[PDB]
PDB file of all heavy atoms in Angstrom:
ATOM      1  N   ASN A   1       0.819  -1.196   0.000  1.00  0.00           N
ATOM      2  CA  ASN A   1       0.000   0.000   0.000  1.00  0.00           C
ATOM      3  C   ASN A   1       0.865   1.263   0.000  1.00  0.00           C
ATOM      4  O   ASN A   1       0.595   2.209  -0.758  1.00  0.00           O
ATOM      5  CB  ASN A   1      -0.892  -0.008   1.238  1.00  0.00           C
ATOM      6  CG  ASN A   1      -2.013  -1.088   1.162  1.00  0.00           C
ATOM      7  OD1 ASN A   1      -2.373  -1.548   0.093  1.00  0.00           O
ATOM      8  ND2 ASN A   1      -2.588  -1.422   2.305  1.00  0.00           N
ATOM      9  N   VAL A   2       1.990   1.231   0.734  1.00  0.00           N
ATOM     10  CA  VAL A   2       2.864   2.398   0.801  1.00  0.00           C
ATOM     11  C   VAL A   2       3.520   2.642  -0.557  1.00  0.00           C
ATOM     12  O   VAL A   2       3.514   3.765  -1.071  1.00  0.00           O
ATOM     13  CB  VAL A   2       3.888   2.240   1.935  1.00  0.00           C
ATOM     14  CG1 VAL A   2       4.969   3.273   1.820  1.00  0.00           C
ATOM     15  CG2 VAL A   2       3.210   2.393   3.243  1.00  0.00           C
ATOM     16  N   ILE A   3       4.108   1.605  -1.159  1.00  0.00           N
ATOM     17  CA  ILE A   3       4.904   1.859  -2.355  1.00  0.00           C
ATOM     18  C   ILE A   3       4.006   2.033  -3.565  1.00  0.00           C
ATOM     19  O   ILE A   3       4.476   2.519  -4.607  1.00  0.00           O
ATOM     20  CB  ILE A   3       5.938   0.749  -2.594  1.00  0.00           C
ATOM     21  CG1 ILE A   3       5.277  -0.561  -3.002  1.00  0.00           C
ATOM     22  CG2 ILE A   3       6.760   0.536  -1.285  1.00  0.00           C
ATOM     23  CD1 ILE A   3       6.281  -1.688  -3.297  1.00  0.00           C
ATOM     24  N   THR A   4       2.732   1.620  -3.458  1.00  0.00           N
ATOM     25  CA  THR A   4       1.746   1.881  -4.490  1.00  0.00           C
ATOM     26  C   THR A   4       1.362   3.340  -4.476  1.00  0.00           C
ATOM     27  O   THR A   4       1.083   3.915  -5.526  1.00  0.00           O
ATOM     28  CB  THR A   4       0.502   1.014  -4.275  1.00  0.00           C
ATOM     29  OG1 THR A   4       0.839  -0.341  -4.557  1.00  0.00           O
ATOM     30  CG2 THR A   4      -0.627   1.444  -5.165  1.00  0.00           C
ATOM     31  N   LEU A   5       1.350   3.945  -3.291  1.00  0.00           N
ATOM     32  CA  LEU A   5       0.954   5.341  -3.192  1.00  0.00           C
ATOM     33  C   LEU A   5       2.154   6.278  -3.328  1.00  0.00           C
ATOM     34  O   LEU A   5       2.075   7.324  -3.965  1.00  0.00           O
ATOM     35  CB  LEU A   5       0.259   5.592  -1.848  1.00  0.00           C
ATOM     36  CG  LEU A   5      -0.259   7.019  -1.567  1.00  0.00           C
ATOM     37  CD1 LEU A   5      -1.270   7.448  -2.633  1.00  0.00           C
ATOM     38  CD2 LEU A   5      -0.884   7.206  -0.151  1.00  0.00           C
ATOM     39  N   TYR A   6       3.263   5.941  -2.726  1.00  0.00           N
ATOM     40  CA  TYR A   6       4.451   6.797  -2.733  1.00  0.00           C
ATOM     41  C   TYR A   6       5.505   6.156  -3.611  1.00  0.00           C
ATOM     42  O   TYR A   6       6.269   5.311  -3.149  1.00  0.00           O
ATOM     43  CB  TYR A   6       4.949   7.004  -1.339  1.00  0.00           C
ATOM     44  CG  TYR A   6       3.944   7.712  -0.466  1.00  0.00           C
ATOM     45  CD1 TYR A   6       3.203   7.017   0.488  1.00  0.00           C
ATOM     46  CD2 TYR A   6       3.749   9.073  -0.577  1.00  0.00           C
ATOM     47  CE1 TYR A   6       2.281   7.682   1.309  1.00  0.00           C
ATOM     48  CE2 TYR A   6       2.870   9.739   0.217  1.00  0.00           C
ATOM     49  CZ  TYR A   6       2.122   9.044   1.161  1.00  0.00           C
ATOM     50  OH  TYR A   6       1.223   9.737   1.941  1.00  0.00           O
ATOM     51  N   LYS A   7       5.546   6.555  -4.889  1.00  0.00           N
ATOM     52  CA  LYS A   7       6.293   5.798  -5.893  1.00  0.00           C
ATOM     53  C   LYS A   7       7.797   6.010  -5.780  1.00  0.00           C
ATOM     54  O   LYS A   7       8.583   5.348  -6.481  1.00  0.00           O
ATOM     55  CB  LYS A   7       5.792   6.192  -7.297  1.00  0.00           C
ATOM     56  N   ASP A   8       8.207   6.930  -4.908  1.00  0.00           N
ATOM     57  CA  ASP A   8       9.637   7.206  -4.643  1.00  0.00           C
ATOM     58  C   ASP A   8      10.073   6.489  -3.363  1.00  0.00           C
ATOM     59  O   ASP A   8      11.219   6.678  -2.996  1.00  0.00           O
ATOM     60  CB  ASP A   8       9.910   8.708  -4.644  1.00  0.00           C
ATOM     61  CG  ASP A   8       9.818   9.286  -6.043  1.00  0.00           C
ATOM     62  OD1 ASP A   8       9.830   8.494  -7.002  1.00  0.00           O
ATOM     63  OD2 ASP A   8       9.696  10.516  -6.157  1.00  0.00           O
ATOM     64  N   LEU A   9       9.216   5.696  -2.711  1.00  0.00           N
ATOM     65  CA  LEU A   9       9.627   4.846  -1.596  1.00  0.00           C
ATOM     66  C   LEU A   9       9.894   3.438  -2.142  1.00  0.00           C
ATOM     67  O   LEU A   9       9.022   2.866  -2.798  1.00  0.00           O
ATOM     68  CB  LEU A   9       8.542   4.805  -0.515  1.00  0.00           C
ATOM     69  CG  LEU A   9       8.355   6.092   0.278  1.00  0.00           C
ATOM     70  CD1 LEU A   9       7.259   5.969   1.334  1.00  0.00           C
ATOM     71  CD2 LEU A   9       9.699   6.551   0.911  1.00  0.00           C
ATOM     72  N   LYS A  10      11.078   2.875  -1.869  1.00  0.00           N
ATOM     73  CA  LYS A  10      11.520   1.583  -2.417  1.00  0.00           C
ATOM     74  C   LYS A  10      11.787   0.622  -1.261  1.00  0.00           C
ATOM     75  O   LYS A  10      12.341   1.052  -0.236  1.00  0.00           O
ATOM     76  CB  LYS A  10      12.791   1.730  -3.300  1.00  0.00           C
ATOM     77  N   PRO A  11      11.318  -0.632  -1.324  1.00  0.00           N
ATOM     78  CA  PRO A  11      11.652  -1.608  -0.256  1.00  0.00           C
ATOM     79  C   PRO A  11      13.045  -2.210  -0.439  1.00  0.00           C
ATOM     80  O   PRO A  11      13.379  -2.724  -1.507  1.00  0.00           O
ATOM     81  CB  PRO A  11      10.565  -2.687  -0.386  1.00  0.00           C
ATOM     82  CG  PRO A  11       9.966  -2.514  -1.754  1.00  0.00           C
ATOM     83  CD  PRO A  11      10.372  -1.163  -2.321  1.00  0.00           C
ATOM     84  N   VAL A  12      13.826  -2.233   0.637  1.00  0.00           N
ATOM     85  CA  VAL A  12      15.209  -2.696   0.572  1.00  0.00           C
ATOM     86  C   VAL A  12      15.542  -3.553   1.795  1.00  0.00           C
ATOM     87  O   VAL A  12      15.092  -3.275   2.915  1.00  0.00           O
ATOM     88  CB  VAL A  12      16.189  -1.498   0.486  1.00  0.00           C
ATOM     89  CG1 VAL A  12      17.612  -1.987   0.520  1.00  0.00           C
ATOM     90  CG2 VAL A  12      15.950  -0.688  -0.781  1.00  0.00           C
ATOM     91  N   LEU A  13      16.378  -4.560   1.595  1.00  0.00           N
ATOM     92  CA  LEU A  13      16.850  -5.408   2.687  1.00  0.00           C
ATOM     93  C   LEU A  13      18.244  -4.958   3.114  1.00  0.00           C
ATOM     94  O   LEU A  13      19.138  -4.859   2.271  1.00  0.00           O
ATOM     95  CB  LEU A  13      16.869  -6.877   2.282  1.00  0.00           C
ATOM     96  CG  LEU A  13      15.527  -7.562   2.467  1.00  0.00           C
ATOM     97  CD1 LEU A  13      15.700  -9.050   2.240  1.00  0.00           C
ATOM     98  CD2 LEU A  13      14.935  -7.311   3.858  1.00  0.00           C
ATOM     99  N   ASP A  14      18.430  -4.686   4.397  1.00  0.00           N
ATOM    100  CA  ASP A  14      19.674  -4.128   4.886  1.00  0.00           C
ATOM    101  C   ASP A  14      19.820  -4.545   6.339  1.00  0.00           C
ATOM    102  O   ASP A  14      18.897  -5.084   6.964  1.00  0.00           O
ATOM    103  CB  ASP A  14      19.748  -2.607   4.759  1.00  0.00           C
ATOM    104  N   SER A  15      21.028  -4.390   6.865  1.00  0.00           N
ATOM    105  CA  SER A  15      21.355  -4.828   8.240  1.00  0.00           C
ATOM    106  C   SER A  15      21.080  -3.701   9.221  1.00  0.00           C
ATOM    107  O   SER A  15      21.648  -2.619   9.038  1.00  0.00           O
ATOM    108  CB  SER A  15      22.784  -5.276   8.323  1.00  0.00           C
ATOM    109  N   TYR A  16      20.255  -3.960  10.225  1.00  0.00           N
ATOM    110  CA  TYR A  16      19.920  -2.960  11.261  1.00  0.00           C
ATOM    111  C   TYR A  16      20.832  -3.193  12.463  1.00  0.00           C
ATOM    112  O   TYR A  16      20.807  -4.304  13.016  1.00  0.00           O
ATOM    113  CB  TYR A  16      18.435  -3.043  11.607  1.00  0.00           C
ATOM    114  CG  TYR A  16      17.992  -2.096  12.690  1.00  0.00           C
ATOM    115  CD1 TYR A  16      17.392  -0.892  12.375  1.00  0.00           C
ATOM    116  CD2 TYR A  16      18.172  -2.404  14.026  1.00  0.00           C
ATOM    117  CE1 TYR A  16      16.978  -0.012  13.358  1.00  0.00           C
ATOM    118  CE2 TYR A  16      17.764  -1.536  15.024  1.00  0.00           C
ATOM    119  CZ  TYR A  16      17.168  -0.335  14.688  1.00  0.00           C
ATOM    120  OH  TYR A  16      16.762   0.525  15.664  1.00  0.00           O
ATOM    121  N   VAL A  17      21.598  -2.179  12.854  1.00  0.00           N
ATOM    122  CA  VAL A  17      22.541  -2.260  14.008  1.00  0.00           C
ATOM    123  C   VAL A  17      21.768  -1.942  15.278  1.00  0.00           C
ATOM    124  O   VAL A  17      21.441  -0.768  15.479  1.00  0.00           O
ATOM    125  CB  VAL A  17      23.736  -1.312  13.819  1.00  0.00           C
ATOM    126  N   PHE A  18      21.514  -2.938  16.114  1.00  0.00           N
ATOM    127  CA  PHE A  18      20.697  -2.776  17.297  1.00  0.00           C
ATOM    128  C   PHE A  18      21.510  -2.153  18.440  1.00  0.00           C
ATOM    129  O   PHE A  18      22.745  -2.112  18.443  1.00  0.00           O
ATOM    130  CB  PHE A  18      20.116  -4.134  17.779  1.00  0.00           C
ATOM    131  CG  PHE A  18      19.129  -4.808  16.826  1.00  0.00           C
ATOM    132  CD1 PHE A  18      19.544  -5.874  16.015  1.00  0.00           C
ATOM    133  CD2 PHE A  18      17.811  -4.388  16.757  1.00  0.00           C
ATOM    134  CE1 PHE A  18      18.680  -6.483  15.148  1.00  0.00           C
ATOM    135  CE2 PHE A  18      16.940  -4.999  15.913  1.00  0.00           C
ATOM    136  CZ  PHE A  18      17.372  -6.049  15.090  1.00  0.00           C
ATOM    137  N   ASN A  19      20.771  -1.721  19.464  1.00  0.00           N
ATOM    138  CA  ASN A  19      21.428  -1.186  20.643  1.00  0.00           C
ATOM    139  C   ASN A  19      22.221  -2.266  21.390  1.00  0.00           C
ATOM    140  O   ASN A  19      23.259  -1.976  21.990  1.00  0.00           O
ATOM    141  CB  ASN A  19      20.399  -0.553  21.580  1.00  0.00           C
ATOM    142  N   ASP A  20      21.723  -3.507  21.409  1.00  0.00           N
ATOM    143  CA  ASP A  20      22.457  -4.602  22.040  1.00  0.00           C
ATOM    144  C   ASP A  20      23.846  -4.751  21.443  1.00  0.00           C
ATOM    145  O   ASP A  20      24.795  -5.179  22.113  1.00  0.00           O
ATOM    146  CB  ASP A  20      21.642  -5.892  21.883  1.00  0.00           C
ATOM    147  N   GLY A  21      23.997  -4.406  20.161  1.00  0.00           N
ATOM    148  CA  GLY A  21      25.185  -4.753  19.392  1.00  0.00           C
ATOM    149  C   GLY A  21      25.000  -5.841  18.343  1.00  0.00           C
ATOM    150  O   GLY A  21      25.772  -5.905  17.370  1.00  0.00           O
ATOM    151  N   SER A  22      24.025  -6.733  18.546  1.00  0.00           N
ATOM    152  CA  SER A  22      23.584  -7.660  17.526  1.00  0.00           C
ATOM    153  C   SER A  22      23.119  -6.927  16.256  1.00  0.00           C
ATOM    154  O   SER A  22      22.904  -5.696  16.177  1.00  0.00           O
ATOM    155  CB  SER A  22      22.482  -8.534  18.121  1.00  0.00           C
ATOM    156  OG  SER A  22      21.490  -7.744  18.790  1.00  0.00           O
ATOM    157  N   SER A  23      22.929  -7.742  15.230  1.00  0.00           N
ATOM    158  CA  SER A  23      22.479  -7.205  13.970  1.00  0.00           C
ATOM    159  C   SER A  23      21.546  -8.189  13.283  1.00  0.00           C
ATOM    160  O   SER A  23      21.731  -9.408  13.314  1.00  0.00           O
ATOM    161  CB  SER A  23      23.656  -6.864  13.043  1.00  0.00           C
ATOM    162  N   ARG A  24      20.510  -7.628  12.652  1.00  0.00           N
ATOM    163  CA  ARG A  24      19.609  -8.507  11.888  1.00  0.00           C
ATOM    164  C   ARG A  24      19.260  -7.893  10.522  1.00  0.00           C
ATOM    165  O   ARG A  24      19.312  -6.674  10.315  1.00  0.00           O
ATOM    166  CB  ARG A  24      18.305  -8.914  12.658  1.00  0.00           C
ATOM    167  N   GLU A  25      18.947  -8.766   9.551  1.00  0.00           N
ATOM    168  CA  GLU A  25      18.536  -8.296   8.229  1.00  0.00           C
ATOM    169  C   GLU A  25      17.038  -7.948   8.283  1.00  0.00           C
ATOM    170  O   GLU A  25      16.173  -8.808   8.535  1.00  0.00           O
ATOM    171  CB  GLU A  25      18.786  -9.358   7.139  1.00  0.00           C
ATOM    172  CG  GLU A  25      18.901  -8.820   5.707  1.00  0.00           C
ATOM    173  CD  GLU A  25      19.925  -9.562   4.838  1.00  0.00           C
ATOM    174  OE1 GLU A  25      19.667 -10.746   4.477  1.00  0.00           O
ATOM    175  OE2 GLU A  25      20.981  -8.944   4.521  1.00  0.00           O
ATOM    176  N   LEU A  26      16.735  -6.659   8.063  1.00  0.00           N
ATOM    177  CA  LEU A  26      15.378  -6.133   8.094  1.00  0.00           C
ATOM    178  C   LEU A  26      15.116  -5.352   6.817  1.00  0.00           C
ATOM    179  O   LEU A  26      16.034  -4.822   6.180  1.00  0.00           O
ATOM    180  CB  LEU A  26      15.166  -5.254   9.326  1.00  0.00           C
ATOM    181  CG  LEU A  26      15.329  -5.998  10.658  1.00  0.00           C
ATOM    182  CD1 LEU A  26      15.195  -4.975  11.773  1.00  0.00           C
ATOM    183  CD2 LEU A  26      14.353  -7.123  10.873  1.00  0.00           C
ATOM    184  N   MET A  27      13.860  -5.351   6.426  1.00  0.00           N
ATOM    185  CA  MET A  27      13.413  -4.524   5.329  1.00  0.00           C
ATOM    186  C   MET A  27      13.169  -3.099   5.814  1.00  0.00           C
ATOM    187  O   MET A  27      12.687  -2.887   6.934  1.00  0.00           O
ATOM    188  CB  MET A  27      12.191  -5.154   4.661  1.00  0.00           C
ATOM    189  CG  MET A  27      11.787  -4.350   3.408  1.00  0.00           C
ATOM    190  SD  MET A  27      10.263  -4.872   2.669  1.00  0.00           S
ATOM    191  CE  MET A  27       9.100  -4.317   3.921  1.00  0.00           C
ATOM    192  N   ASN A  28      13.595  -2.118   4.998  1.00  0.00           N
ATOM    193  CA  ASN A  28      13.208  -0.733   5.223  1.00  0.00           C
ATOM    194  C   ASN A  28      12.634  -0.148   3.936  1.00  0.00           C
ATOM    195  O   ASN A  28      12.931  -0.583   2.823  1.00  0.00           O
ATOM    196  CB  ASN A  28      14.422   0.032   5.770  1.00  0.00           C
ATOM    197  CG  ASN A  28      15.547   0.213   4.768  1.00  0.00           C
ATOM    198  OD1 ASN A  28      15.440   0.977   3.813  1.00  0.00           O
ATOM    199  ND2 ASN A  28      16.546  -0.632   4.884  1.00  0.00           N
ATOM    200  N   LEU A  29      11.840   0.877   4.107  1.00  0.00           N
ATOM    201  CA  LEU A  29      11.322   1.668   3.007  1.00  0.00           C
ATOM    202  C   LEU A  29      12.147   2.931   2.945  1.00  0.00           C
ATOM    203  O   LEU A  29      12.200   3.691   3.911  1.00  0.00           O
ATOM    204  CB  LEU A  29       9.853   1.964   3.270  1.00  0.00           C
ATOM    205  CG  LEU A  29       9.084   0.638   3.295  1.00  0.00           C
ATOM    206  CD1 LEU A  29       7.596   0.839   3.536  1.00  0.00           C
ATOM    207  CD2 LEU A  29       9.298  -0.171   1.977  1.00  0.00           C
ATOM    208  N   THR A  30      12.814   3.135   1.841  1.00  0.00           N
ATOM    209  CA  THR A  30      13.690   4.288   1.741  1.00  0.00           C
ATOM    210  C   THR A  30      13.429   5.054   0.446  1.00  0.00           C
ATOM    211  O   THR A  30      13.025   4.482  -0.575  1.00  0.00           O
ATOM    212  CB  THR A  30      15.168   3.885   1.854  1.00  0.00           C
ATOM    213  OG1 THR A  30      15.971   5.070   1.884  1.00  0.00           O
ATOM    214  CG2 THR A  30      15.582   3.018   0.656  1.00  0.00           C
ATOM    215  N   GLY A  31      13.573   6.360   0.525  1.00  0.00           N
ATOM    216  CA  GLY A  31      13.262   7.166  -0.648  1.00  0.00           C
ATOM    217  C   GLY A  31      12.724   8.510  -0.221  1.00  0.00           C
ATOM    218  O   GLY A  31      13.086   9.009   0.835  1.00  0.00           O
ATOM    219  N   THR A  32      11.827   9.084  -1.021  1.00  0.00           N
ATOM    220  CA  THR A  32      11.330  10.405  -0.671  1.00  0.00           C
ATOM    221  C   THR A  32       9.809  10.377  -0.587  1.00  0.00           C
ATOM    222  O   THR A  32       9.150   9.584  -1.238  1.00  0.00           O
ATOM    223  CB  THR A  32      11.773  11.534  -1.668  1.00  0.00           C
ATOM    224  OG1 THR A  32      11.296  11.300  -3.001  1.00  0.00           O
ATOM    225  CG2 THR A  32      13.263  11.678  -1.745  1.00  0.00           C
ATOM    226  N   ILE A  33       9.275  11.275   0.230  1.00  0.00           N
ATOM    227  CA  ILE A  33       7.856  11.582   0.225  1.00  0.00           C
ATOM    228  C   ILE A  33       7.605  13.052  -0.129  1.00  0.00           C
ATOM    229  O   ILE A  33       8.431  13.922   0.181  1.00  0.00           O
ATOM    230  CB  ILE A  33       7.191  11.277   1.577  1.00  0.00           C
ATOM    231  CG1 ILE A  33       7.964  11.893   2.724  1.00  0.00           C
ATOM    232  CG2 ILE A  33       7.100   9.763   1.786  1.00  0.00           C
ATOM    233  CD1 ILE A  33       7.192  11.904   3.987  1.00  0.00           C
ATOM    234  N   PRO A  34       6.495  13.348  -0.821  1.00  0.00           N
ATOM    235  CA  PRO A  34       6.174  14.719  -1.256  1.00  0.00           C
ATOM    236  C   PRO A  34       5.565  15.490  -0.085  1.00  0.00           C
ATOM    237  O   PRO A  34       4.716  14.966   0.644  1.00  0.00           O
ATOM    238  CB  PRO A  34       5.146  14.507  -2.373  1.00  0.00           C
ATOM    239  CG  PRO A  34       4.426  13.288  -1.941  1.00  0.00           C
ATOM    240  CD  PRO A  34       5.478  12.382  -1.285  1.00  0.00           C
ATOM    241  N   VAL A  35       6.125  16.671   0.188  1.00  0.00           N
ATOM    242  CA  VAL A  35       5.707  17.527   1.287  1.00  0.00           C
ATOM    243  C   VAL A  35       5.488  18.970   0.846  1.00  0.00           C
ATOM    244  O   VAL A  35       6.455  19.657   0.503  1.00  0.00           O
ATOM    245  CB  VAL A  35       6.744  17.511   2.425  1.00  0.00           C
ATOM    246  CG1 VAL A  35       6.319  18.437   3.608  1.00  0.00           C
ATOM    247  CG2 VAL A  35       7.005  16.052   2.986  1.00  0.00           C
ATOM    248  N   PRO A  36       4.278  19.500   0.916  1.00  0.00           N
ATOM    249  CA  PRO A  36       4.095  20.924   0.593  1.00  0.00           C
ATOM    250  C   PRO A  36       4.638  21.795   1.722  1.00  0.00           C
ATOM    251  O   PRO A  36       4.312  21.596   2.894  1.00  0.00           O
ATOM    252  CB  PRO A  36       2.584  21.077   0.452  1.00  0.00           C
ATOM    253  CG  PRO A  36       2.063  19.687   0.307  1.00  0.00           C
ATOM    254  CD  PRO A  36       3.011  18.747   0.928  1.00  0.00           C
ATOM    255  N   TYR A  37       5.401  22.813   1.335  1.00  0.00           N
ATOM    256  CA  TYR A  37       5.954  23.812   2.237  1.00  0.00           C
ATOM    257  C   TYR A  37       6.101  25.162   1.530  1.00  0.00           C
ATOM    258  O   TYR A  37       6.828  25.311   0.536  1.00  0.00           O
ATOM    259  CB  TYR A  37       7.278  23.324   2.848  1.00  0.00           C
ATOM    260  CG  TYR A  37       7.868  24.391   3.732  1.00  0.00           C
ATOM    261  CD1 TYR A  37       7.359  24.624   4.999  1.00  0.00           C
ATOM    262  CD2 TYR A  37       8.966  25.125   3.315  1.00  0.00           C
ATOM    263  CE1 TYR A  37       7.873  25.588   5.793  1.00  0.00           C
ATOM    264  CE2 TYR A  37       9.506  26.093   4.112  1.00  0.00           C
ATOM    265  CZ  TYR A  37       8.945  26.317   5.362  1.00  0.00           C
ATOM    266  OH  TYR A  37       9.435  27.272   6.208  1.00  0.00           O
ATOM    267  N   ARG A  38       5.311  26.108   2.028  1.00  0.00           N
ATOM    268  CA  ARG A  38       5.301  27.498   1.613  1.00  0.00           C
ATOM    269  C   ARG A  38       5.339  27.667   0.095  1.00  0.00           C
ATOM    270  O   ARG A  38       6.086  28.490  -0.444  1.00  0.00           O
ATOM    271  CB  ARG A  38       6.466  28.251   2.287  1.00  0.00           C
ATOM    272  N   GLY A  39       4.430  26.979  -0.601  1.00  0.00           N
ATOM    273  CA  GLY A  39       4.225  27.242  -2.014  1.00  0.00           C
ATOM    274  C   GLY A  39       4.954  26.307  -2.953  1.00  0.00           C
ATOM    275  O   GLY A  39       4.817  26.458  -4.173  1.00  0.00           O
ATOM    276  N   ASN A  40       5.780  25.406  -2.424  1.00  0.00           N
ATOM    277  CA  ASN A  40       6.439  24.361  -3.199  1.00  0.00           C
ATOM    278  C   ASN A  40       6.280  22.988  -2.557  1.00  0.00           C
ATOM    279  O   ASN A  40       5.978  22.859  -1.376  1.00  0.00           O
ATOM    280  CB  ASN A  40       7.923  24.737  -3.379  1.00  0.00           C
ATOM    281  CG  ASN A  40       8.098  26.092  -4.073  1.00  0.00           C
ATOM    282  OD1 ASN A  40       8.310  27.117  -3.437  1.00  0.00           O
ATOM    283  ND2 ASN A  40       8.081  26.067  -5.389  1.00  0.00           N
ATOM    284  N   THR A  41       6.488  21.949  -3.362  1.00  0.00           N
ATOM    285  CA  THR A  41       6.482  20.573  -2.889  1.00  0.00           C
ATOM    286  C   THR A  41       7.922  20.084  -2.840  1.00  0.00           C
ATOM    287  O   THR A  41       8.633  20.107  -3.845  1.00  0.00           O
ATOM    288  CB  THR A  41       5.643  19.675  -3.795  1.00  0.00           C
ATOM    289  OG1 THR A  41       4.277  20.101  -3.718  1.00  0.00           O
ATOM    290  CG2 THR A  41       5.744  18.191  -3.356  1.00  0.00           C
ATOM    291  N   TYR A  42       8.345  19.639  -1.677  1.00  0.00           N
ATOM    292  CA  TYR A  42       9.696  19.140  -1.472  1.00  0.00           C
ATOM    293  C   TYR A  42       9.715  17.627  -1.336  1.00  0.00           C
ATOM    294  O   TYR A  42       8.794  17.040  -0.771  1.00  0.00           O
ATOM    295  CB  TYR A  42      10.348  19.786  -0.244  1.00  0.00           C
ATOM    296  CG  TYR A  42      10.467  21.290  -0.388  1.00  0.00           C
ATOM    297  CD1 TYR A  42       9.428  22.112  -0.012  1.00  0.00           C
ATOM    298  CD2 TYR A  42      11.639  21.892  -0.945  1.00  0.00           C
ATOM    299  CE1 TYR A  42       9.512  23.471  -0.169  1.00  0.00           C
ATOM    300  CE2 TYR A  42      11.750  23.292  -1.087  1.00  0.00           C
ATOM    301  CZ  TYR A  42      10.694  24.070  -0.699  1.00  0.00           C
ATOM    302  OH  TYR A  42      10.804  25.434  -0.867  1.00  0.00           O
ATOM    303  N   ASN A  43      10.755  16.998  -1.886  1.00  0.00           N
ATOM    304  CA  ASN A  43      10.963  15.554  -1.750  1.00  0.00           C
ATOM    305  C   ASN A  43      11.833  15.315  -0.518  1.00  0.00           C
ATOM    306  O   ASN A  43      13.069  15.418  -0.567  1.00  0.00           O
ATOM    307  CB  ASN A  43      11.563  15.018  -3.037  1.00  0.00           C
ATOM    308  CG  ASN A  43      10.602  15.159  -4.233  1.00  0.00           C
ATOM    309  OD1 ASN A  43       9.424  14.766  -4.177  1.00  0.00           O
ATOM    310  ND2 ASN A  43      11.063  15.851  -5.256  1.00  0.00           N
ATOM    311  N   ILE A  44      11.172  14.992   0.592  1.00  0.00           N
ATOM    312  CA  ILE A  44      11.832  14.809   1.882  1.00  0.00           C
ATOM    313  C   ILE A  44      12.351  13.379   1.948  1.00  0.00           C
ATOM    314  O   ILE A  44      11.560  12.436   1.773  1.00  0.00           O
ATOM    315  CB  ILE A  44      10.881  15.099   3.045  1.00  0.00           C
ATOM    316  CG1 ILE A  44      10.326  16.520   2.883  1.00  0.00           C
ATOM    317  CG2 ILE A  44      11.628  14.932   4.357  1.00  0.00           C
ATOM    318  CD1 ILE A  44      11.377  17.605   2.890  1.00  0.00           C
ATOM    319  N   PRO A  45      13.658  13.170   2.094  1.00  0.00           N
ATOM    320  CA  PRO A  45      14.203  11.807   2.087  1.00  0.00           C
ATOM    321  C   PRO A  45      13.998  11.131   3.439  1.00  0.00           C
ATOM    322  O   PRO A  45      14.313  11.728   4.471  1.00  0.00           O
ATOM    323  CB  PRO A  45      15.693  12.024   1.774  1.00  0.00           C
ATOM    324  CG  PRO A  45      16.000  13.409   2.274  1.00  0.00           C
ATOM    325  CD  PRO A  45      14.728  14.194   2.094  1.00  0.00           C
ATOM    326  N   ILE A  46      13.416   9.919   3.453  1.00  0.00           N
ATOM    327  CA  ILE A  46      13.147   9.219   4.704  1.00  0.00           C
ATOM    328  C   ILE A  46      13.572   7.755   4.556  1.00  0.00           C
ATOM    329  O   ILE A  46      13.866   7.260   3.452  1.00  0.00           O
ATOM    330  CB  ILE A  46      11.680   9.266   5.169  1.00  0.00           C
ATOM    331  CG1 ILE A  46      10.773   8.569   4.186  1.00  0.00           C
ATOM    332  CG2 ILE A  46      11.273  10.741   5.355  1.00  0.00           C
ATOM    333  CD1 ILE A  46       9.430   8.293   4.760  1.00  0.00           C
ATOM    334  N   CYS A  47      13.646   7.094   5.719  1.00  0.00           N
ATOM    335  CA  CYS A  47      13.945   5.676   5.881  1.00  0.00           C
ATOM    336  C   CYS A  47      13.082   5.136   7.019  1.00  0.00           C
ATOM    337  O   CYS A  47      13.137   5.660   8.149  1.00  0.00           O
ATOM    338  CB  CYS A  47      15.440   5.487   6.200  1.00  0.00           C
ATOM    339  SG  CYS A  47      15.936   3.785   6.333  1.00  0.00           S
TER     340      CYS A  47
END
């Protein structure tokens, strides 16, 4: 539903560094979302 609506968000598999120090392979959504701000739309990069 997210990547169908926000076409600049891409699903990716990457290693998440936990607070314990362990690490696991997790999916994240990374890319940009469209944000209106003072008369323009900005592509805000998120993860």
